[PDB]
Amino acid sequence: QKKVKKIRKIILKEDIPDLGKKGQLLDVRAGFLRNFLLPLGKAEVVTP
Amino acid sequence: RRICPFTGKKSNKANRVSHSNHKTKRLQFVNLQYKRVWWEAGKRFVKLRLSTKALKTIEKNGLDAVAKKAGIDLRKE
RNA sequence: UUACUGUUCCCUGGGAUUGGCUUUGGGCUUUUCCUGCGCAGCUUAGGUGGAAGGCGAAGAAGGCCCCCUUCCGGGGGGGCCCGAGCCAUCAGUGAGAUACCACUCUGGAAGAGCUAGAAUUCUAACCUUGUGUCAGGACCUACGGGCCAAGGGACAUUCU
RNA sequence: CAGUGCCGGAAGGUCAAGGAAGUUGGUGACCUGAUGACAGGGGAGCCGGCGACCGAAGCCCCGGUGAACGGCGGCCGUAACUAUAACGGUCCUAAGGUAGCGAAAUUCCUUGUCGGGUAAGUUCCGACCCGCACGAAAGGCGUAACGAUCUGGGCACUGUC
RNA sequence: CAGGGCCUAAGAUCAGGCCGAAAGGCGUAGUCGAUGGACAACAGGUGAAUAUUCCUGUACUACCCCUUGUUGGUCCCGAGG
RNA sequence: AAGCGAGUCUUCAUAGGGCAAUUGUCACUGCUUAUGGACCCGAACCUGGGUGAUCUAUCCAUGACCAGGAUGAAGCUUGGGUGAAACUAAGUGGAGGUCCGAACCGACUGAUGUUGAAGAAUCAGCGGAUGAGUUGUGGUUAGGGGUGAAAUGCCACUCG
RNA sequence: AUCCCGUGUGAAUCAGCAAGGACCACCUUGCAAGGCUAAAUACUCCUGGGUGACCGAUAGCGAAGUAGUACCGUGAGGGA
RNA sequence: GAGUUGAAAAUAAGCAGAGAUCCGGAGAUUCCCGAAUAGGUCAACCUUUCGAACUUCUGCUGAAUCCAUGGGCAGGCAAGAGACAACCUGGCGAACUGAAACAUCUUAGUAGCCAGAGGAAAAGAAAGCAAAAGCGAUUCCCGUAGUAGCGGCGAGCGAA
Ligand SMILES: [Mg+2]
Ligand SMILES: [Mg+2]
Ligand SMILES: [Mg+2]
Ligand SMILES: [Mg+2]
Ligand SMILES: [Mg+2]
Ligand SMILES: [Mg+2]
Ligand SMILES: [Mg+2]
Ligand SMILES: [Mg+2]
Ligand SMILES: [Mg+2]
Ligand SMILES: [Mg+2]
Ligand SMILES: [Mg+2]
Ligand SMILES: [Mg+2]
Ligand SMILES: [Mg+2]
Ligand SMILES: [Mg+2]
Ligand SMILES: [Mg+2]
Ligand SMILES: [Mg+2]
Ligand SMILES: [Mg+2]
Ligand SMILES: [Mg+2]
Ligand SMILES: [Mg+2]
Ligand SMILES: [Mg+2]
Ligand SMILES: [Mg+2]
Ligand SMILES: [Mg+2]
Ligand SMILES: [Mg+2]
Ligand SMILES: [Mg+2]
Ligand SMILES: [Mg+2]
Ligand SMILES: [Mg+2]
Ligand SMILES: [Mg+2]
Ligand SMILES: [Mg+2]
Ligand SMILES: [Mg+2]
Ligand SMILES: [Mg+2]
Ligand SMILES: [Mg+2]
Ligand SMILES: [Mg+2]
Ligand SMILES: [Mg+2]
Ligand SMILES: [Mg+2]
Ligand SMILES: [Mg+2]
Ligand SMILES: [Mg+2]
Ligand SMILES: [Mg+2]
Ligand SMILES: [Mg+2]
Ligand SMILES: [Mg+2]
Ligand SMILES: [Mg+2]
Ligand SMILES: [Mg+2]
Ligand SMILES: [Mg+2]
Ligand SMILES: [Mg+2]
Ligand SMILES: [Mg+2]
Ligand SMILES: [Mg+2]
Ligand SMILES: [Mg+2]
Ligand SMILES: [Mg+2]
Ligand SMILES: [Mg+2]
Ligand SMILES: [Mg+2]
Numbered sequence A: 001q002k003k004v005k006k007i008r009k010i011i012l013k014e015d016i017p018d019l020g021k022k023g024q025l026l027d028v029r030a031g032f033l034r035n036f037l038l039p040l041g042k043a044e045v046v047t048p
Numbered sequence B: 001r002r003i004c005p006f007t008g009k010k011s012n013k014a015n016r017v018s019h020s021n022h023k024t025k026r027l028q029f030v031n032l033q034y035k036r037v038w039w040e041a042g043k044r045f046v047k048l049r050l051s052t053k054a055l056k057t058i059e060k061n062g063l064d065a066v067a068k069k070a071g072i073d074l075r076k077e
Numbered sequence C: 001u002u003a004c005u006g007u008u009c010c011c012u013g014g015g016a017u018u019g020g021c022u023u024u025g026g027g028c029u030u031u032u033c034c035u036g037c038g039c040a041g042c043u044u045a046g047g048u049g050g051a052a053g054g055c056g057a058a059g060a061a062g063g064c065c066c067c068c069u070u071c072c073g074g075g076g077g078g079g080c081c082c083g084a085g086c087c088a089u090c091a092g093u094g095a096g097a098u099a100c101c102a103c104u105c106u107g108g109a110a111g112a113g114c115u116a117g118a119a120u121u122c123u124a125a126c127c128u129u130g131u132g133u134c135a136g137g138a139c140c141u142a143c144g145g146g147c148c149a150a151g152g153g154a155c156a157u158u159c160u
Numbered sequence D: 001c002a003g004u005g006c007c008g009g010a011a012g013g014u015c016a017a018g019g020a021a022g023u024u025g026g027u028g029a030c031c032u033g034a035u036g037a038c039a040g041g042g043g044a045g046c047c048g049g050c051g052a053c054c055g056a057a058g059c060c061c062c063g064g065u066g067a068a069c070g071g072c073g074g075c076c077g078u079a080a081c082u083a084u085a086a087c088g089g090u091c092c093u094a095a096g097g098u099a100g101c102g103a104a105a106u107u108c109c110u111u112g113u114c115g116g117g118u119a120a121g122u123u124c125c126g127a128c129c130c131g132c133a134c135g136a137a138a139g140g141c142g143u144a145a146c147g148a149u150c151u152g153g154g155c156a157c158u159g160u161c
Numbered sequence E: 001c002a003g004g005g006c007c008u009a010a011g012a013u014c015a016g017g018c019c020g021a022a023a024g025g026c027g028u029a030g031u032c033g034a035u036g037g038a039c040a041a042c043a044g045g046u047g048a049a050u051a052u053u054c055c056u057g058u059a060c061u062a063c064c065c066c067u068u069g070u071u072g073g074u075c076c077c078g079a080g081g
Numbered sequence F: 001a002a003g004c005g006a007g008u009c010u011u012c013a014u015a016g017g018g019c020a021a022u023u024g025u026c027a028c029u030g031c032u033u034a035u036g037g038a039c040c041c042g043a044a045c046c047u048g049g050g051u052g053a054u055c056u057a058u059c060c061a062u063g064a065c066c067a068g069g070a071u072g073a074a075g076c077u078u079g080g081g082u083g084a085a086a087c088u089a090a091g092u093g094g095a096g097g098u099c100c101g102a103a104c105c106g107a108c109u110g111a112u113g114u115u116g117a118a119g120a121a122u123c124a125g126c127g128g129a130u131g132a133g134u135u136g137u138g139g140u141u142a143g144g145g146g147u148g149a150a151a152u153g154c155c156a157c158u159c160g
Numbered sequence G: 001a002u003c004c005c006g007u008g009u010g011a012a013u014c015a016g017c018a019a020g021g022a023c024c025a026c027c028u029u030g031c032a033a034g035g036c037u038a039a040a041u042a043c044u045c046c047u048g049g050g051u052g053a054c055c056g057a058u059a060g061c062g063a064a065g066u067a068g069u070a071c072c073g074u075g076a077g078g079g080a
Numbered sequence H: 001g002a003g004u005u006g007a008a009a010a011u012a013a014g015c016a017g018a019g020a021u022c023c024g025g026a027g028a029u030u031c032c033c034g035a036a037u038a039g040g041u042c043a044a045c046c047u048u049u050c051g052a053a054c055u056u057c058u059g060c061u062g063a064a065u066c067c068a069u070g071g072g073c074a075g076g077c078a079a080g081a082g083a084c085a086a087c088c089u090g091g092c093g094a095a096c097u098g099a100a101a102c103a104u105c106u107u108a109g110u111a112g113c114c115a116g117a118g119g120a121a122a123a124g125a126a127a128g129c130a131a132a133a134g135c136g137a138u139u140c141c142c143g144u145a146g147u148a149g150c151g152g153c154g155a156g157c158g159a160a
């Protein structure tokens, strides 16, 4: 139907460009999260 | 086959219908992708054909839940 | 076959697979500022309310000039010079003072915001190669497997 | 280069799914009406219709392209005698059949007319052009060699007669 | 002598592999597949019905057997043919 | 139709009009009707699933074959041409989808045959015969197909 | 409406959720997204009994004898 | 309980009242092909180092790669595989026909094919009916009923 921007809320475990310092809270697109951050150990998807 | 292992999706049997009401056999297919998925508990990727719904579900429940319900060992994959 | 109804190849848009940074830009804004020739006239009467108080040395009236809008009638406004005034029922006018202040409308501006569209990159999805390189008792210049690299790249492919 | 096809073009019109400002309806916590066996308005929610504007290709639009599909006309009048028409007028088209050939595997009327071959020729050869209805890569016109090809004549030869 | 116990061509099947409503389709190593490559026998005789097959002569391949001579050979692989 | 009910619908009006104010049933036998193959025999066809390339149509692999005779291209060597080259007899050479002609492949005319000797032949003649040739063995392509030097031909005496 | 599937979005837990033929209110009924279960019912390549207003060699099974045989077809198949 | 060595005589020999031939239960053997399964093949054969191939099972072993996966070796009377008339369940799924043509509709989710399992299968323990009164998993028959409905409101289809 209408494209709905997917929003994954995450914590950064290392510092990455444009994102920020280690141990940081953010919200991201699903593609960015699962295809880039997550395989490289860089981020962690959070649902407490 | 055009089948997702994980959700067991099948191609669906459907009539294409014209403005004239004239019916025709047709196939709607599962949306299948050749994807690599990260497996954290294996520290490694797995090549799979997946439905997109399956990809979703893997985001939601984590890969291992899904593969355990579908009974498919990530090792033999 | 330019009969009818369709199907298919194929082309093109939405959705999905599908991401990052940057630009440029169409339509809405968030403070806030620009802007109005019924006639009776101090005169290009903004509607509605608080309404005898405001604007000044964190420096006005008044003349010297820069800019922009323009119905060249005049309006906002930067610099400087200037130094104690522009003021209200003061009478007109359906509606009041450019003393001031709130949500705002006619269109303009600006930094900020939503959504496209568009163009440009980037690399990790995805695609394509490899007599590149490992590999089991031994091979895989036998298809293929893992790793690495190379070229593309969010296009394309596949699905709806 | 009008029609059709094909290619290229991007300014305007048209243009689906889908978005979408916004209106609109049903219900209804409730609020009032009413000498009839009831009725009228209505918040939130839920549900439904409509929907300005955004919305690609294609089409309409502009240009090219015949060894792409195909197409290549009428009517008049005129010259030392009959005649004919080089030359003019007009009409209509995208444009009006050039070179070469022509009674042809094409010619209706038709055994056209003329010449030749025969004692005698509806066939044959050459030429005229009045091409019903030739014509240029669905090629036009030539052409040595070739053909169990089609067609006319001649010598030899024969019971074909 | 002719095929098989040898080798491969066209082609066929095809472990794993890729794809596909099912059946299956494609395809790698492998394995099949002669109409080809490789490989050693002729004359005479007999003869109701067989003969390069049985008889008599000379042959020829492949193994095994002994003597002698050496110590590594065998396959996998590199090559010539 | 709510509904009324020996009445009711239409109506301002019973004013008129419409329809109503009553009726057995269960079998068996027959005749007909309907539904199934439906009185019987008779198509061309249509679709589904298999079976076929021992014939023929293309090809693939690997083999084999084509008596005999002619003709005489290039080339080459010689020898006159000029400094180079051209031009010309000569010899040699042995090309050709060359020629004549058996095998072999065809099938042009005629006669015979027509309940044939034969579901395409015999007889006399005829075309090709070193090639775009002939053929053997083993394979390939399969019917919404295949193959086609194209006839709608061929795909087991069957092929719009 | 109820039911079940492709593509995309995507809830609520009993103060709920679903159904009552678009939809809303009220009331009634029910508890989806985990499984498994006998009988009553269908059938005859057959087995054992039984009956027949069934046939009696052109009938009854194609087949009362080599019967899926002989024969025909490359084959599927036909078939006395 | 007396004769016997199939149809099936004849011949030849046996076996037999310490019980033959015969009938029933349980075992044994079961060449070659066939799922075919040591490898091959043109079924009923060949070659073999004599082997239930492959997939599951148990153990040992342990690639690229640490855990693993794959592979290798061994054990094992070893689970499966194939066959099967109709019925059944799932999957694919027509066309002639009817409609006096035909396209929606009908034929019909029928035939056919494929896969699967059983003596039956499937369904099945209310997120169900119903209607203000009540029922109490599924299946099957009678009836409701050719009713309500569906329908180029046609042919027809047809509940609860
Ligand atoms: Mg999304
Ligand atoms: Mg698309
Ligand atoms: Mg996208
Ligand atoms: Mg790269
Ligand atoms: Mg490799
Ligand atoms: Mg590699
Ligand atoms: Mg790049
Ligand atoms: Mg894309
Ligand atoms: Mg034109
Ligand atoms: Mg044109
Ligand atoms: Mg043009
Ligand atoms: Mg165009
Ligand atoms: Mg457009
Ligand atoms: Mg719209
Ligand atoms: Mg709206
Ligand atoms: Mg309303
Ligand atoms: Mg009310
Ligand atoms: Mg209301
Ligand atoms: Mg638009
Ligand atoms: Mg031309
Ligand atoms: Mg004439
Ligand atoms: Mg004539
Ligand atoms: Mg004459
Ligand atoms: Mg004559
Ligand atoms: Mg002539
Ligand atoms: Mg003509
Ligand atoms: Mg013409
Ligand atoms: Mg012509
Ligand atoms: Mg001509
Ligand atoms: Mg032409
Ligand atoms: Mg020609
Ligand atoms: Mg000539
Ligand atoms: Mg010829
Ligand atoms: Mg081969
Ligand atoms: Mg195969
Ligand atoms: Mg396999
Ligand atoms: Mg192979
Ligand atoms: Mg062999
Ligand atoms: Mg041989
Ligand atoms: Mg030998
Ligand atoms: Mg030999
Ligand atoms: Mg003999
Ligand atoms: Mg001899
Ligand atoms: Mg001797
Ligand atoms: Mg020897
Ligand atoms: Mg070698
Ligand atoms: Mg009356
Ligand atoms: Mg019939
Ligand atoms: Mg037809």
Ligand SMILES: [Mg+2]
Pocket: none
């Ligand atoms: Mg068929």
Ligand SMILES: [Mg+2]
Pocket: none
């Ligand atoms: Mg076949």
Ligand SMILES: [Mg+2]
Pocket: none
């Ligand atoms: Mg064959």
Ligand SMILES: [Mg+2]
Pocket: F053
């Ligand atoms: Mg053949």
Ligand SMILES: [Mg+2]
Pocket: none
């Ligand atoms: Mg032949």
Ligand SMILES: [Mg+2]
Pocket: none
């Ligand atoms: Mg050959």
Ligand SMILES: [Mg+2]
Pocket: none
């Ligand atoms: Mg010979």
Ligand SMILES: [Mg+2]
Pocket: none
């Ligand atoms: Mg010769």
Ligand SMILES: [Mg+2]
Pocket: none
């Ligand atoms: Mg010669």
Ligand SMILES: [Mg+2]
Pocket: none
């Ligand atoms: Mg010749």
Ligand SMILES: [Mg+2]
Pocket: none
């Ligand atoms: Mg010749």
Ligand SMILES: [Mg+2]
Pocket: none
């Ligand atoms: Mg011929």
Ligand SMILES: [Mg+2]
Pocket: none
């Ligand atoms: Mg002859």
Ligand SMILES: [Mg+2]
Pocket: none
């Ligand atoms: Mg001859």
Ligand SMILES: [Mg+2]
Pocket: F101, F129
């Ligand atoms: Mg000849």
Ligand SMILES: [Mg+2]
Pocket: F130
């Ligand atoms: Mg030659």
